[PDB]
């Protein structure tokens, strides 16, 4: 079926509807909530059962049963009160739930074991069901630890479900969960001029690999070099294998005879430091390649490992670099909380046994189990790790990493949005890394390559793309449904060769072979598009390595794409606005990971690339969804220099003053700022049309002229209008909170005197609502009894009118008070501003209205900037936005005189699919203006027609939080 008859605008409308359905179904914080939900539903039980039972012997055995968690409640009275996160914020409490486990001890009841912090809007939050306590602008995903809001930064680790080939001694390595599972094959010289030989580092014991071959059960050297499968030639490979044979014979005397090699690995394993409590046969069935059944299969896997090393040696295979994100997994709340809970669960069990072992020697006299287990160990450890930032090291024991838990910012809703979507590569000494600080081509579609910090964390902290998803673990077994597509068993004879067949690997474990690989993969992918295989299953066909890799584990980065061959199923459908589930269930869309995307030809978003030539398998939804949430909304963002886009999307949008909250009566933040009249931009990108949010933009639409103003706007200064400021442009409200606490001696009181300045205080020690407090006054009166008090005084620049006074208490007996002060500011002569293209500057002059230069309708500018700023900063997009916006706020003069005068109006400016300049200038020409964007203006002080034409138009400007009256200091 041709796709030409579907048409291009139909496909654009479908792309917009499909992205809108994505954002309705998933939101922007699904990657935090899904991970926490998986930890509560599954991973908690896996921790408490994988920990295992134990028996103290000076016998008494204990076993952990099933684990239950119940909703957060308050026991202030002996009533059970519902506990909401705003209660936890205002009372300086931690918002947490109780965990119960039922133990079984024999030498049986339910014991409380700790409190775990609850993520807001998760399955344990009481706000999941204009409720009292909620803001409309808020989504979940944060924690309230001791009254403060914290977030997890996702941690990147290497993928340990594959083999890693180095080249420093030419190593190939297998890793797993257990530290007793590490397996290394090395190709080196353990010594003139020895030939390079093969060595095994298993259980901290160097063994020749030929001995391990005959220990696992192989009979002949010819079938051992069949297990390696040299692919012929390559005299270095033949030299290394005959050197390893005649070096195996130089260590054991006739290892090929019955159980000689097995006795050798007995006496080689057992002589180490800390030998394992096992014979070698149970050592092989336990610690050698977990997931394989027979020793035949372990010999086959060792031959495959040696083949991989020899293929990397000859230059036919590449070494793994850890900057390619197909070798990385991403750890979020479940993966980190499991690791943190295992430490304090072990610390609880360890101080349980040495407390029981006294009273057990001491006759039964055994207590109930709630005595021998302290519950505050887990509770204190989790909250200490949240409130200090020191998590546990991923693989070092007894160590602690530091870049894990961050503070949640609430300056505008966009700063809170981008603080929840970050990713980090932690490094040892910051300042000597490889290509970690740079964009790699495997970031495409999943991490933003334009926005990143510029300090020490430049490039090490990444931002998720808009349509990016983090996968989760699949709990159903998948290996038995692989046989239905043409996969066959891995037999046990170690004598049959397997040439021509491709190997299949499920999470790194070899489970079978397949003869035809270009039918196996295409049938698995067809069964995934009809919802009888899981949607997060990654299938990669590898022609050079002759291999089929399948991944079902957690931590992979996914994104949706159109499936071209199922794309004709829209015509026959109905264009009612879709669900995402219905488009997934018909095979029109797919979720695709980084490794599968290497087998994909994707058209560049543009339907005109797709439908002018059909040599493609997929197509993007939009190219601007390659960027993060603060970079995809920037107009003409591919028209500016990259340092400027970085300035806008990482720094200046977090500092703008706009929306703050919709329920400010229960928010006692340190600083809260807000505009009087926030506006939205005139232009419409694709991401802003798809998310349908207004709080992504924080600023005003100011009319900007580009002109010199008596030398007052040099060196990146700006000139503003006095009358536009008096009518309320950029007028700001600011609320500051001053807090104090006492025990429940020092108390709150009037302090009985005027040691500072006490005018507005009542008997309780707090002022009245509506008081006008001045610098030098006393805001909170903590009268120590019989004098010698410690009150709180306003500093030398802290003013305001009292907005509210809040009195809170704790559960452990501590009182808190908070007083909020309201100020109203219009811009003064050193306040800081910036456009949406990285052109920051300071206000240097405020001009009267009748002194400004004016047009033939009487329009004067609000902001005047210098023309020396444009040839040098490389931000031409600021001229193209202003020329577009002026075209869409003007009336169409109707030279045609038809009905639909405003039908063909251009207003998008989406990145990577911007309008051309002929469309922008034709839009300006239809509105009655010159195409070049400038217009004649009269001089305001003398009245004469000025000789130069001036560029004018509306730009979205932002008022930043750096204000002049806060920078004044004197020593």
Partner DNA sequence: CTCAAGTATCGTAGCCTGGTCATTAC
Partner DNA sequence: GTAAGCTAGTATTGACGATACTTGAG
Partner RNA sequence: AAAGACCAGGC
Residues forming contacts to DNA in the complex (CB under 7 A) are 146, 148, 157-158, 160, 173, 175, 179-180, 182-184, 201-204, 206, 273-274, 322-323, 346, 350, 384, 387-388, 394-395, 397-398, 425, 427-429, 431-436
263 or 406: CB nearest RNA? 406
436 or 710: CB nearest another protein? 710
Give the three-state DSSP class for 481. Answer: helix
- C-alpha 227/C-alpha 496 separation (Å) is 9
- C-alpha 143/C-alpha 74 separation (Å) is 17
Instruction: Pick out residues in 827-866 that bind another protein (CB under 8 A).
Output: 853
Which listed option, RNA, another protein, DNA, none, makes contact with residue 475 (CB within 5 to 8 Å by class)? none
259 or 543: CB nearest another protein? 259
Least Å from the CB of residue 409 to DNA = 12
Is residue 947 a contact point for another protein (CB under 8 A)? yes
* Residue 940, burial from CB neighbour count under 10 angstroms (0-12, 13-18, 19+): middle
Residue 693 DSSP class: -
The interface mask with RNA, positions 407-436, x = CB under 7 A, is x-----------------------------
Residue 161 and residue 326 in contact, taking contact as beta carbons nearer than 8 Å = no
395 or 519: CB nearest DNA? 395
Residue 381 and residue 343 in contact, taking contact as beta carbons nearer than 8 Å = yes
Maximal C-alpha separation, the chain: 111
Helix pair 260-269, 209-216: axis angle to 10 deg: 120
* Torsion, CA 937, CA 942, CA 943, CA 945, rounded to 10: -50
- C-alpha 967/C-alpha 830 separation (Å) is 9
Give the interface segment with RNA, choosing from 398-406, 504-512, 615-623, 846-854 (CB under 7 A). Answer: 398-406
Is residue 798 a contact point for another protein (CB under 8 A)? no
- C-alpha 748/C-alpha 299 separation (Å) is 77
Give the interface segment with another protein, choosing from 123-131, 355-363, 658-666, 706-714 (CB under 8 A). Answer: 706-714
Task: Residue 646: name the closest of 461, 435, 417 by CA.
Answer: 461
- C-alpha 223/C-alpha 880 separation (Å) is 71
- C-alpha 162/C-alpha 326 separation (Å) is 11
Least Å from the CB of residue 200 to DNA = 9
Give the interface segment with RNA, choosing from 449-457, 513-521, 608-616, 677-685 (CB under 7 A). Answer: 449-457
Task: Provide the token pair at 573.
Answer: 């459908």
280, 883, 960, 963: residue in contact with another protein (rule CB under 8 A): 883
Start-to-end Cα distance in the chain: 79
233 or 277: CB nearest another protein? 233
Is residue 870 a contact point for another protein (CB under 8 A)? yes
* Residue 77, burial from CB neighbour count under 10 angstroms (0-12, 13-18, 19+): exposed
* Residue 838, burial from CB neighbour count under 10 angstroms (0-12, 13-18, 19+): buried
Element (H, E) at 183: strand 183-188
879, 884, 960, 963: residue in contact with another protein (rule CB under 8 A): 879
Which residues does 571 contact at the CB level (< 8 Å), separation at least 6?
A: 6
Give the interface segment with RNA, choosing from 270-278, 401-409, 857-865, 899-907 (CB under 7 A). Answer: 401-409
Least Å from the CB of residue 964 to another protein = 24
Which listed option, DNA, RNA, another protein, none, makes contact with residue 651 (CB within 5 to 8 Å by class)? RNA
Is residue 195 a contact point for another protein (CB under 8 A)? yes
Which residues does 460 contact at the CB level (< 8 Å), separation at least 6?
A: 424, 425, 426, 427, 430, 433, 436, 437
Is residue 651 a contact point for RNA (CB under 7 A)? yes
Give the interface segment with another protein, choosing from 192-200, 423-431, 563-571, 795-803 (CB under 8 A). Answer: 192-200
Partners of 955 in the beta sheet? Answer: 702
77, 235, 544, 895: residue in contact with another protein (rule CB under 8 A): 235
Least Å from the CB of residue 818 to DNA = 13
Element (H, E) at 883: helix 877-888
156 or 881: CB nearest another protein? 881
Is residue 165 a contact point for another protein (CB under 8 A)? no
The interface mask with another protein, positions 913-942, x = CB under 8 A, is ----x---x---------xxxx--x-x-xx
Which listed option, RNA, another protein, DNA, none, makes contact with residue 436 (CB within 5 to 8 Å by class)? DNA
Is residue 459 a contact point for RNA (CB under 7 A)? no
Interface with RNA: number of residues (CB under 7 A)? 11
Q: Up-side HSE of residue 578: CA atoms within 13 Å toward CB?
A: 23
Residue 640 and residue 874 in contact, taking contact as beta carbons nearer than 8 Å = yes
Helices H / strands E in the chain, number of each: 23, 41
Is residue 317 a contact point for another protein (CB under 8 A)? no
Least Å from the CB of residue 534 to RNA = 37
Helix pair 877-888, 917-926: axis angle to 10 deg: 40
Interface with another protein: number of residues (CB under 8 A)? 54
Kind of pairing between the strands at 700-706 and 143-145: unpaired
Least Å from the CB of residue 435 to DNA = 6
Give the interface segment with another protein, choosing from 435-443, 561-569, 643-651, 700-708 (CB under 8 A). Answer: 700-708
What phi and psi values does residue 312 have, to the nearest 5 degrees? -70, -35
Is residue 403 a contact point for RNA (CB under 7 A)? yes
Residues engaged in binding another protein (CB under 8 A): 192-195, 219-223, 233-236, 238-239, 242, 245-246, 249, 254, 256, 314, 705-711, 853, 867, 870-871, 876, 879-880, 883, 917, 921, 931-934, 937, 939, 941-942, 944, 946-951
Residues engaged in binding RNA (CB under 7 A): 389, 402-403, 406-407, 453, 455, 457, 651, 655, 962
């Amino acid at each position: 079926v041709d796709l030409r008859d579907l048409g291009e605008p139909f496909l654009q409308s479908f792309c917009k509807k499909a992205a809108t359905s994505f954002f309705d179904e998933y939101g922007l914080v699904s990657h935090q909530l899904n991970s926490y939900n998986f930890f509560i539903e599954h991973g908690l039980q896996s921790v408490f059962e994988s920990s295992g039972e134990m028996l103290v012997e000076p016998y008494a055995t204990v076993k952990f049963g099933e684990v239950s968690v119940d909703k957060p409640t308050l026991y202030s009275d002996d009533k059970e009160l519902v506990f909401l996160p705003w209660h936890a914020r205002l009372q300086n409490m931690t918002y947490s739930a109780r965990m119960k486990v039922n133990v079984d001890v024999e030498v049986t009841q339910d014991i409380p074991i700790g409190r775990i912090p609850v993520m807001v809007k998760s399955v344990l939050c009481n706000t999941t069901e204009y409720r009292k306590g909620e803001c409309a602008f808020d989504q979940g995903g944060y924690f309230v630890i001791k009254g403060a809001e914290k977030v997890f930064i996702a941690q990147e680790q290497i993928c340990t479900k594959r083999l890693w080939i180095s080249n420093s001694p030419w190593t190939v390595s297998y890793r797993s969960e257990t530290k007793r599972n590490r397996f290394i094959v090395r190709l080196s010289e353990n010594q003139k001029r020895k030939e390079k030989v093969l060595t095994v580092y298993f259980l901290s014991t160097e063994i020749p690999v030929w001995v391990l071959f005959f220990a696992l059960g192989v009979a002949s050297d010819k079938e051992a070099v069949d297990l390696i499968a040299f692919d012929g030639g390559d005299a270095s490979i033949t030299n290394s294998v005959v050197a390893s044979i005649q070096e195996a014979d130089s260590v054991c005397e006739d290892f090929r005879h019955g159980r000689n090699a097995l006795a050798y690995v007995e006496q080689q394993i057992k002589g180490t430091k800390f030998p394992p409590g096992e014979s070698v046969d149970e050592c092989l069935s336990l610690y050698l390649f977990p997931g394989l059944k027979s020793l035949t299969q372990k010999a086959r896997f060792l031959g495959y490992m040696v083949k991989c090393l020899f293929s990397a040696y000859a230059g036919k295979r590449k070494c793994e670099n850890r900057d390619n994100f197909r070798n990385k997994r991403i750890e979020l709340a479940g993966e980190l909380l499991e690791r943190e809970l295992r430490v304090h669960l072990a610390h609880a069990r360890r101080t349980m046994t040495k407390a029981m072992q006294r009273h057990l020697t001491g006759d039964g006299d055994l207590k109930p189990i709630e005595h021998y287990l302290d519950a505050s160990i887990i509770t204190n450890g989790l909250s200490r790790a949240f409130s200090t930032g020191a998590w546990c090291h991923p693989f070092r024991k007894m160590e602690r990493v530091s870049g894990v838990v961050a503070n949640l910012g609430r300056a505008n809703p966009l700063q809170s949005l981008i603080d929840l979507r970050r990713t980090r590569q932690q490094v040892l000494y910051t300042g000597r890394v490889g290509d970690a600080r740079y964009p790699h081509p495997s970031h495409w579609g999943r991490l933003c390559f334009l926005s990143t910090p510029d300090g020490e964390n430049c490039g090490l902290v990444k931002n998720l793309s808009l349509l990016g998803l983090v996968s989760t673990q699949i709990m159903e077994p998948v290996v038995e449904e692989l046989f239905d597509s043409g996969m066959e068993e891995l037999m046990d004879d170690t004598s049959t060769p397997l040439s021509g067949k491709h190997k299949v690997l499920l999470n790194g474990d070899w489970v079978g072979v397949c003869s035809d690989s270009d039918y196996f993969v295409a049938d698995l992918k067809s069964r995934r598009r009809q919802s009888e295989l899981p949607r997060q299953m990654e299938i990669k066909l590898d022609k050079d390595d002759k291999e089929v890799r399948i991944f079902t584990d957690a931590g992979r980065l996914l994104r949706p794409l159109l499936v071209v061959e199922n794309l004709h199923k829209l015509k026959q459908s109905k264009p009612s606005k879709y669900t995402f589930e219905h488009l997934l269930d018909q095979g029109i869309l797919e979720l695709i990971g980084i490794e599968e995307e290497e087998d994909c030809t994707t058209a560049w978003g543009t339907k005109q690339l797709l439908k002018q030539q059909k040599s493609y398998t997929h197509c993007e939804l939009d190219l601007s969804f390659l960027l993060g949430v603060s970079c995809a909304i920037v107009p003409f963002a591919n028209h500016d220099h990259g340092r400027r886009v970085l300035y806008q999307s990482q720094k200046h949008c977090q500092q703008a003053i706009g929306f703050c909250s919709t329920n400010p009566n229960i928010r006692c933040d340190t600083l809260s700022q807000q505009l009087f009249y926030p506006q939205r931009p005139l232009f419409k990108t694709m991401a802003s049309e798809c998310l349908q949010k207004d709080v992504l933009f924080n600023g005003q639409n100011a009319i900007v002229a580009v002109n010199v103003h008596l030398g007052f706007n040099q060196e990146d200064s700006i000139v503003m209008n006095k009358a536009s400021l008096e009518r309320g442009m950029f007028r700001s409200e600011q609320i500051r909170s001053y807090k104090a606490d006492v025990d429940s001696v020092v108390q709150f009181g009037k302090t009985h005197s005027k040691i500072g300045r006490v005018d507005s205080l009542d008997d309780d020690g707090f002022p009245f609502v509506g008081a006008n407090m001045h610098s030098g006054d006393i805001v909170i009166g903590r009268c120590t009894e019989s004098g010698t008090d410690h009150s709180v005084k306003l500093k030398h620049t802290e003013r305001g009118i009292v907005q509210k006074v809040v009195l809170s208490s704790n559960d452990d007996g501590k009182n808190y008070a908070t007083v909020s002060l309201r100020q109203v500011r219009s811009p003064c002569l050193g306040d800081k501003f910036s456009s949406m293209h990285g052109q920051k500057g300071v206000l240097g002059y405020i001009e009267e209205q009748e002194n400004f230069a004016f047009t033939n309708q009487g329009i004067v500018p609000d902001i005047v900037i210098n023309p020396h700023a444009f040839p040098s900063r490389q931000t031409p997009g600021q001229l193209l936005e202003a020329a577009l916006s002026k075209g869409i706020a003007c009336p169409m003069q109707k030279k045609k005189g038809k009905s639909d005068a405003y039908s063909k109006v251009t207003r998008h400016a989406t990145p990577f699919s911007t309008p051309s300049v002929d469309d922008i200038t034709d839009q300006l020409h239809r509105a009655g203006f010159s195409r070049s964007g400038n217009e004649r203006v009269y001089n305001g002080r003398t009245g004469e027609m000025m000789r130069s034409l001036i560029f004018m138009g509306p730009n979205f400007y932002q008022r930043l939080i750096h204000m002049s009256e806060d920078k004044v200091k004197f020593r």
